[PDB]
Structure 1
Amino acid sequence: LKTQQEQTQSQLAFLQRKFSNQALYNWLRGRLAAIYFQFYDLAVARCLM
């Protein structure tokens, strides 16, 4: 069980240290939702054009 505790901690340390972690997708979603809203105003502009 002490091995399984250390093995659980290694998976937890892996999910936090890998590149495609949660902090990547918070960055990707927050940046893209800012782009996608600004791109929305440009495309509705030409739908009105």
Structure 2
Amino acid sequence: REAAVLQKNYLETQQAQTQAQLAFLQSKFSNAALYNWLRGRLSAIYYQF
């Protein structure tokens, strides 16, 4: 039983680590929103050029 409680603590640690990776990818400067803006702006510039 105590081994299973440690396993649940391990899984909750993995949940918090997955959320930490997710928050890093949301909050990084080179996230998907920068590339959305970047290709939309460059697409407009590219058609006019």
TM range, normalised to the smaller chain?
Answer: 0.7 to 0.9
Q: Which runs of 5+ in 1 are unaligned?
A: 40-49
* Aligned partner (choices 33, 36, 39) of residue 23 of structure 1: 33
What are the superposed Cα offsets for residues 1-49 of structure 1, whole Å, 9 maximum, x if unpaired?
000000000000000000000000000000000000000xxxxxxxxxx
Say how many residue pairs are matched: 39
Hey, which bits of structure 1, 4+ residues long, moved more than 3 A? none
RMSD (Å), alpha carbons: 0.2
Identity %: 82
| TM-score normalised per structure 1 | 0.79
CA distance in 1, matches of 2:13, 2:45: 46
State the AA in 2 paired with 1:11.
Q
Which residue of structure 2 aligns with residue 2 of structure 1?
Answer: 12
* TM superposition score normalised by structure 2: 0.79
